[PDB]
Every structure is written in C-alpha cells, then in structure tokens.
Amino acid sequence: WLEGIRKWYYNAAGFNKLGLMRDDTIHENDDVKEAIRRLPENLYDDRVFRIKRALDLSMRQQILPKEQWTKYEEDKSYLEPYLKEVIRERKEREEWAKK
Amino acid sequence: AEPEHDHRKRMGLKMLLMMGLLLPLVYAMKRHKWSVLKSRKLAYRPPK
Amino acid sequence: ADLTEYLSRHYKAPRMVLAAAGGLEHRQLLDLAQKHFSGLSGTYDEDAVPTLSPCRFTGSQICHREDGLPLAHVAIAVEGPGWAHPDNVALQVANAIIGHYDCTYGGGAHLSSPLASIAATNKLCQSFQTFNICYADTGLLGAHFVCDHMSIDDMMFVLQGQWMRLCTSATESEVLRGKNLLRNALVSHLDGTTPVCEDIGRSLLTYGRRIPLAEWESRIAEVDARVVREVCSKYFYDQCPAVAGFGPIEQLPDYNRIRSGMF
Amino acid sequence: LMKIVNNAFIDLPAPSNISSWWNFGSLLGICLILQILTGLFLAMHYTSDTTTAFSSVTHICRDVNYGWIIRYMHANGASMFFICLYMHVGRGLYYGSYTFLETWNIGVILLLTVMATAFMGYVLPWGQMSFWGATVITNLLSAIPYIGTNLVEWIWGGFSVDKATLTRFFAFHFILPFIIMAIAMVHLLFLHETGSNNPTGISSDVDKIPFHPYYTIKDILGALLLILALMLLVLFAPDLLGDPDNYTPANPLNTPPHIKPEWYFLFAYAILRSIPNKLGGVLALAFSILILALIPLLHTSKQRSMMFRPLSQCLFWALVADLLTLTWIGGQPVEHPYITIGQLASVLYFLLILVLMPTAGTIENKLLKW
Amino acid sequence: VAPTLTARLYSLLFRRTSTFALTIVVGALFFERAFDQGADAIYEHINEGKLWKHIKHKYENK
Amino acid sequence: RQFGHLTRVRHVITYSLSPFEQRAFPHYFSKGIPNVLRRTRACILRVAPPFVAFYLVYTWGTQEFEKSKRKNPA
Numbered sequence A: 001w002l003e004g005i006r007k008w009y010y011n012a013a014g015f016n017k018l019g020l021m022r023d024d025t026i027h028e029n030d031d032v033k034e035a036i037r038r039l040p041e042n043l044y045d046d047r048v049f050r051i052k053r054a055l056d057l058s059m060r061q062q063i064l065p066k067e068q069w070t071k072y073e074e075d076k077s078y079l080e081p082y083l084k085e086v087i088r089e090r091k092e093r094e095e096w097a098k099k
Numbered sequence B: 001a002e003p004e005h006d007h008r009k010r011m012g013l014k015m016l017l018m019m020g021l022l023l024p025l026v027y028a029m030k031r032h033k034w035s036v037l038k039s040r041k042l043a044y045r046p047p048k
Numbered sequence C: 001a002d003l004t005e006y007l008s009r010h011y012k013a014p015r016m017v018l019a020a021a022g023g024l025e026h027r028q029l030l031d032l033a034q035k036h037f038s039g040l041s042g043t044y045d046e047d048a049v050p051t052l053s054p055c056r057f058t059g060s061q062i063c064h065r066e067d068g069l070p071l072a073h074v075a076i077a078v079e080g081p082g083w084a085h086p087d088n089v090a091l092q093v094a095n096a097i098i099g100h101y102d103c104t105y106g107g108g109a110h111l112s113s114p115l116a117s118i119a120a121t122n123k124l125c126q127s128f129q130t131f132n133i134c135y136a137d138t139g140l141l142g143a144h145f146v147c148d149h150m151s152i153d154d155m156m157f158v159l160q161g162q163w164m165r166l167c168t169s170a171t172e173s174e175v176l177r178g179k180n181l182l183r184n185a186l187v188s189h190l191d192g193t194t195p196v197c198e199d200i201g202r203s204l205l206t207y208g209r210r211i212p213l214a215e216w217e218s219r220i221a222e223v224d225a226r227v228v229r230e231v232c233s234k235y236f237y238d239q240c241p242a243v244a245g246f247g248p249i250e251q252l253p254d255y256n257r258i259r260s261g262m263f
Numbered sequence D: 001l002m003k004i005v006n007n008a009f010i011d012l013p014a015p016s017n018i019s020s021w022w023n024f025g026s027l028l029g030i031c032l033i034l035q036i037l038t039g040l041f042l043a044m045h046y047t048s049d050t051t052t053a054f055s056s057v058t059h060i061c062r063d064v065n066y067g068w069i070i071r072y073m074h075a076n077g078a079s080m081f082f083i084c085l086y087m088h089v090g091r092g093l094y095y096g097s098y099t100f101l102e103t104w105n106i107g108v109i110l111l112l113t114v115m116a117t118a119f120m121g122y123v124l125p126w127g128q129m130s131f132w133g134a135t136v137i138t139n140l141l142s143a144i145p146y147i148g149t150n151l152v153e154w155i156w157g158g159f160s161v162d163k164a165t166l167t168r169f170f171a172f173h174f175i176l177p178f179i180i181m182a183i184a185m186v187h188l189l190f191l192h193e194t195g196s197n198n199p200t201g202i203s204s205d206v207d208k209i210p211f212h213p214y215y216t217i218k219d220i221l222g223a224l225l226l227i228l229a230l231m232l233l234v235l236f237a238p239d240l241l242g243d244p245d246n247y248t249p250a251n252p253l254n255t256p257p258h259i260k261p262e263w264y265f266l267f268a269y270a271i272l273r274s275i276p277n278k279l280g281g282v283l284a285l286a287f288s289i290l291i292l293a294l295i296p297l298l299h300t301s302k303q304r305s306m307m308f309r310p311l312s313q314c315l316f317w318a319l320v321a322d323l324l325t326l327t328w329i330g331g332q333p334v335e336h337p338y339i340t341i342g343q344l345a346s347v348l349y350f351l352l353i354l355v356l357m358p359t360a361g362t363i364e365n366k367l368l369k370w
Numbered sequence E: 001v002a003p004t005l006t007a008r009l010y011s012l013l014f015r016r017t018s019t020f021a022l023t024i025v026v027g028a029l030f031f032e033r034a035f036d037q038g039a040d041a042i043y044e045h046i047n048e049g050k051l052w053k054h055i056k057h058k059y060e061n062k
Numbered sequence F: 001r002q003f004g005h006l007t008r009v010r011h012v013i014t015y016s017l018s019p020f021e022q023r024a025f026p027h028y029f030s031k032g033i034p035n036v037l038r039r040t041r042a043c044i045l046r047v048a049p050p051f052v053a054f055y056l057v058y059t060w061g062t063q064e065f066e067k068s069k070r071k072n073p074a
C-alpha cells in the first residue's frame, strides 16, 4: 500500500498542481537557508521560478493544467545532499561545543 | 423597552441601500487595481 | 526568396528619396538621378503597395529581472503624437527642460534641470535621458535611466514629479531655457554634410518637405509656459505609460504606483 | 513625518497571494478603534455607582442623542471583535503562522487581555449577568491554593461583589483597551521583521507586492463588510447575541436559573463545566487558552502550512467542529446527554491539539519521505 | 465627431483634481437630500398608517 | 524588509497591462463559477465531514434530551 498510498497522498497534498517540487515546500529554518545558499545557480534559479509561479497561481486561486503538474515519479530531492551536509556540519560544531 | 425601534429600522433601510451601492463600487475598485496582477504573465528564460 | 520578395515589394522609386548636401548643384544631382535611377520601378502590383496601418499603444509593463547585472535600466514612455504633429515642438521644449544627465557631467548640483540636479547631489543614477521617438502616427515620449538597484524608486519619483510639474506649473523662465536648448540642439545638429543630408532624406519621407530653420524658429517662438502646460498635460497627465525594466529591478515600482504617479 | 508612515506602510512588501483570511488583522484593529471610540462616548454618560450604573445605561439608550446606536455598536462590536479574533487565530493555526514565535505569543497575550476587557465591560451595566459573571469569573482565582480566597476579596475590594468592585472594573475596562492597543503595536512591530506568511507557507520574498494599493483597497473592502455585519446586528437584531437576563438589574440574592456566559465564552465554559472538580475545571479552562502558546512546540510537519497537508486539514476542521460542539453544549443545561457530549468534546479538543495533529504531521512527513 | 458620456464626464469633472473634488462635494449634497427623501418615502410607504406622522392629524389642533 | 533587499531573482520576465486597458471582471461567471466549483470540490471531503458529524451529534443529542424529559410511566 505505502507506495500506492504515497502517490495518492502526493496528489492529495497538491503542491504538484502548482508545479512545485516537494523540496520547494520545505519550511525554511537556518539549516535549510544555508543549504539553499549552497545550491548551484541553475538549481537555485529553478527553485525561485517554481515558487514564483506557484505564488502567482495561489494568488489567482488557480492551478496548472493537469499535464504540467509535477509527477510523483519524477519529483526528486535536489536539496537533500546540501541540507544533509549542512546538518552534519552543525552537529559536528555542537559536539565540540560540549568541549 | 425599545423606543429606538422604529428609528433603527429606518436607518437599517438606509444602511442596506448605501452598502448596496458602496460594496459593488469598492469591489470594482479592488478588481480594477488587482487586474494588473491577475493578468500578469510570467516567463522563465534561464541561459542554457 | 524572402529577401528578394521584401526588396521587390518595398524598394520602389515612390518610396525613395535621393538626398545630397554639400558642394554640388541640384541640377547636377537631378542629372545624375535621371541617368541612374530612371529604371527604378515605380510600381508593384495592385495588392503590392505596402501600407502602414495604425499601431495601437498599450499602457503596460515588461520586467526582465536579472539580479546578476550591476545596474538597472528603466525606460518609461507615454504615447507620443507622431512625426507630422505640431505638438512635437512643445514636447521637445519640455524634454529639453528635464534634459539628460550622466555621472561625467560637470554641472552637478548646479544643473538647471531639477531632475539632473537632484540626481547629481543625491547620486540617484549614473545617467538618464528624455526622448521623443516618433513614428508615422504614434511614438514614445518619455525617459530612460540607469541606476543602482536601490535608487529606482527615487528616480521614478523625481522623474514623474517633474512631468507633473511641467503639466501644472511650467514657468516662463524655464520654458525659455527649454526653447534656447532646443534652438541650440537644432542648429548644432545640422552641422556637416551628413547630418544635413539625412535631415533632407528623412524630412521628405516624414513631413514630405524640408522644414526650414526659419520655420523651426517660428514654431519654437510660439511656445510659452501655457503651451508647455497644455501640451504636456495632453500627453502625460493621467495617461497610461509603457514601462520596460531590465536588471536588478526588484525596486522598480509596481505599475499601479507608476500610473498613479501620472496624476 | 515621512518614514515609519513612509517605509512602514505604503511600500511595505506583502506576499502577492495572501487571501481573505489575512484581512482579520486589520479588522481586529478596526474593531479595537470602534470599541475605543464608542466606549469613550459611553464613558461620557456612564456612572459606576451601583445605585446609578444600570440607570445611566438606560439613560444613554433612551435620552442621550443617538445613545442607543452608540451603546449597541459597543455591545455588538465586542461580538464582532471575537468573531474576528477566532478567525484570526484559526488562520494562524491552519497556515503555521505561529512559527513567528514572538508575534504569536504576543497574540496569545492579546487574546487573554481582550477576554478580560470584554468580561469587565459586561459587568458595567450591572444587570444580572453582569453581577453573576463578576462573581463567577473573579472566583476562578479562589481555586488557587491557600491564597485564592484572599486574592478574590482583594480584587472585589470586599467580601462580595459590590460597589468597590464595579467602580474599579470601570477604571480597568477604561484603561485596558489602550494597553491592548500598545501591545497590538508591538504585535505588529514583531511581524514587520519577518513580513507576512501566506497560504502556501512558502517564503514569498520572490513575489512581494506593495501593501498600497493592493491591500489597502482589499482592507477597505474587508472593513466595509465588517461594518455591514456590525450594522445588520445593531440595526436589525441588536439583542440577538445578547442575554435577556442582563436587562434585569443585579440581584445579589438570586442567580437566574438558566444563567449562561456571553456566546464567545461558551466553549471555555463547556470545558470548565465538564470537570466535576473545582481546581480541575479552572486548570482546564486556563489551559484551553494557554495551549495556544504550545502550538509552536507541537509542530512536527516539515511544511509550514496545512495547504499541502490533507490529514492535518481534516483534523483542523474536526477541531473547528469540536469548538462549535463545545459552544453548543455550553448553551445547554447540565443534563444528559449533554454532560457526556461536553466531556467527550472537551477531551477531543485537547486530544486533537496535543496528540492527533502532531501525529498527523509526522505521518505526512513519512508519506513524503522526509 | 461625438464623445461618450463617461469620456465627457472625464474631461469636465474627473481630469482636474479641483473639479473632481467639487463634483464629489456638490455630488454629496444633491445625493444626501435625494437619498434621504427617497429612503424615507420607502420607509413611510412600507409602514403606511403606522407612524405618528400618519395618525398625528387625529389628535392635533393643539 | 524593503524592496531592493528582499532576495535574489534571475532570468524571470513579467508582463503586465495597465488596469485601464483591461476588464475588471473578465469571464467573471463563465470561468468564475467553474473555478469556485473546482475549489469547492477540492476541499469538501476535508471540510464537510466534521460538520456533518457535529450536525449528527447535535440532532441526536437534542432529541435524546427531549425524549428523556417526558412520559416515564411506572
């Protein structure tokens, strides 16, 4: 079920209807803000446009034509490698802080 | 218990008539201003 | 094929002007023209004769945000009258009053133009220029400026403020300065055979005649504060502008704000 | 006079996509100003002596020019204030706005302060609900071990709600709204540091629009609808949201048999009434409001807003339906089957907030593989 | 060779701010009188014979 | 927070029309109603169930209360 239920949840969540990728929706804490800053230019510029487009659709209370919805099978984490490292670095600094 | 009974209803009539005018007018003003955002179009042109 | 089609259709004798300026006599030019351009076609089918239709002007804005660029370029214009219109003289006087400016001008804070003066003392832009681009029956009347990303709003504010000031309060002394600048621009421009030749070629195409300096002077002389206020009001006051921005333009004012700034 | 009037309003960057739920903040500001203006005009004719309080209010309504409209605007204004308050808080919970910790906590203090202010204002006319409301609510402090009784009598200025109580309640009611205004200004100062959240819960820095003219005009429209709702009540149903019992002067020897709180206090009242223990009821009452301060700590979702969280939305609406249930129960007699529905509804309230919602947040994170 | 109503209203009353201001002013005065009288008439008609002004004649002459 | 210092955006073009060049209610009903219907359908499974439950408890409880107060012959 999980993958069956996952794809169902993904579409029920609906950020894909605004053309967003899952990582575009993450709550931005300080770890995340640093990961974003580290993104290569193209990934950063793509994220910016998908968010701008989604905010614009939200403002009009509209969604994209179904053929343009982000697809569950294609959504991948572009943020993960950067964020994981940012979190590992901070954990390391905390270990040293305990002397 | 309510000597203002008749007066409040007369004012109520005027209030409804005024809102009947002012609400669609302000609403048209809102749509007028917002039309600039509502019809804006976006294009992403990254060098590639 | 596309090119030959284009050429056969537009390069017709009735659409051309052979102009010349310098040490030569008209008869000689005419002589040479009769000898070398007589074979030039003076016709092109029934549905060939290309004709210009009016071009609608649309109050609008195009913003190409590119934060990677160091300076922002903004161009804003209202619809102008078109080449043949007499209003162009009073509009050139108005544009001369606001003027142009760049960081290398020596006048700085003492410049007569309030915009140039404010721009210089507050370092609001690298440069700016008013313009009156004319086409057959329409045109672009406005200005272009280049500035730092944090100065766009201020530039727009002062620029629009100056347009409104001219619409409602142009003074005789500044209009006299505008007229003098325009007089000097006209004469200093027609200096040399090339500028004169082009003025001949282009004037015949647009006005259908060469407008003499004596006529330009008369048209300029007719302009006074009242005329500047009325003509500027006609084209600027409460009119929708066309706005184009390129570069770090996050601070370019929203169109509604720009539009409100027109009145 | 330029700045702070601006760069602070006109060119304030606002998300391009905030919906109507973002209008309640300005509407609360308007309710506050309406209450303050009508209140001040009422204060110009009200006397706080227990022998003249009720009479001075009838004089306002009967003989003061337009006194009745100012009086009913103040009364219904309080109700509109609460409708807006609850919508405002609801918006914050659904959209994860509470992550703006300082703004949200000052918000919680505002809520408690407005409740205290409305309560005291309600005592001023000195009708039956005024008197018993003053007795019951101040007595909540008596649940405090060993000193509660001392505190109550101190507040009352005696051994029972009397002259001393009414006079100080008029002075407290008078000054609190101004304190609320100052705290609301701090509420806003803290918000301007981050700017507003938006329906998607995603950062809107890439699509900000100026506050003026977009939201200034959107706020005006919202204000007009607020005025419409308020005047419909005042001019066509001024007592709809009120209690007939307060048209009867205070009688300290008799508590009306069907006494009940103002409608906006019914849910909390249902909760307190659900617990057959004094201290237990008062602690649950207090916690029903103070739990708002815990919401930020109970956020488990990797996403800020509920927009993209179907399970959370279902629970959110169950919570809203539960508050509606508690509001209905609070208006009913303490009899079967209401006693049990109220207890269940009270348990559900805390269950939703403390367990179900955080759990849903974690389940949704799993479903999204992070 | 003919302007529409709104285009005419714009040129005469709405373009200048001072005229636009004077149009709203006189507009408000003429509007108030006519709105109030019309609204009252509707009210008194809806309540024909019930108001004091309607039965007042039966007792006056004082 | 002020315009000019919000964030970094590159390669995005925005096109807009003056409000005086456009209708304020374009397809108000033709496209409006359909959108409202889409939006309504998109949330009703999330919003409605709880209130139907309240509606059920309310009618059941009210009726249960009324029944309990009458005819108890014995």
Ligand code: HEM
Binding pocket: D032, D035, D036, D037, D038, D039, D040, D042, D043, D046, D057, D071, D074, D075, D078, D081, D114, D117, D118, D119, D120, D121, D122, D123, D124, D125, D173, D174, D177, D178, D180
């Ligand atoms: C957040 C602000 C306020 C709230 C929520 C509020 C609420 C109330 C309530 C619920 C009542 C009872 C009304 C009734 O049923 O008769 C009341 C009464 C009163 N309030 Fe306020 N009030 C506010 C501000 C003020 C202010 C600023 C003043 C004075 C400067 C004021 C003066 C009065 C007076 C004199 C009465 C008694 C007359 C009456 O009962 O209408 N109020 N208020």
Ligand code: HEM
Binding pocket: D021, D022, D023, D024, D025, D026, D028, D029, D032, D085, D088, D089, D092, D095, D097, D098, D100, D103, D104, D106, D107, D108, D109, D110, D111, D114, D180, D184, D187, D188, D191, D195, D196, D197, D198, D292
């Ligand atoms: C006297 C009461 C209040 C006043 C006058 C007030 C006013 C405002 C205003 C003007 C805004 C900005 C616009 C908006 O988002 O609505 C705002 C935002 C906010 N308020 Fe309040 N508020 C009040 C009470 C509260 C309460 C009770 C809470 C919560 C316990 C609260 C939480 C918030 C939060 C979290 C925001 C940011 C919303 C967002 O950006 O999504 N406020 N408030």
Ligand SMILES: C/C=C(C)/C=C/C=C/[C@H](OC)[C@@H](C)[C@@H](OC)[C@@H](C)CCc1oc2c(O)c(OC)cc(OC)c2c(=O)c1C
Binding pocket: D112, D113, D115, D116, D119, D120, D129, D130, D132, D133, D134, D136, D137, D138, D155, D172, D259, D260, D261, D262, D265, D268, D269, D272, D285, D286, D289
């Ligand atoms: C000097 C100032 C003082 C002492 C102010 C203290 C204010 C405390 C709180 O505000 C912060 C309080 C208003 C707030 O509790 C969180 C409310 C939800 C309390 C709700 C409430 O109302 C009742 C009410 O109104 C009544 O009227 C006829 C009668 C009542 O039972 C018979 C009640 C009642 O049983 C409760 C729980």
Ligand SMILES: CCCCCCO[C@@H]1O[C@H](CO)[C@@H](O)[C@H](O)[C@H]1O
Binding pocket: D240, D241, D242, D243, D244, D261, D262, D263
């Ligand atoms: C907007 C719909 C409001 C709900 C109508 C009922 O309203 C309720 O009526 C009771 C008496 O019947 C009052 O004692 C109570 O205070 C009031 O809130």
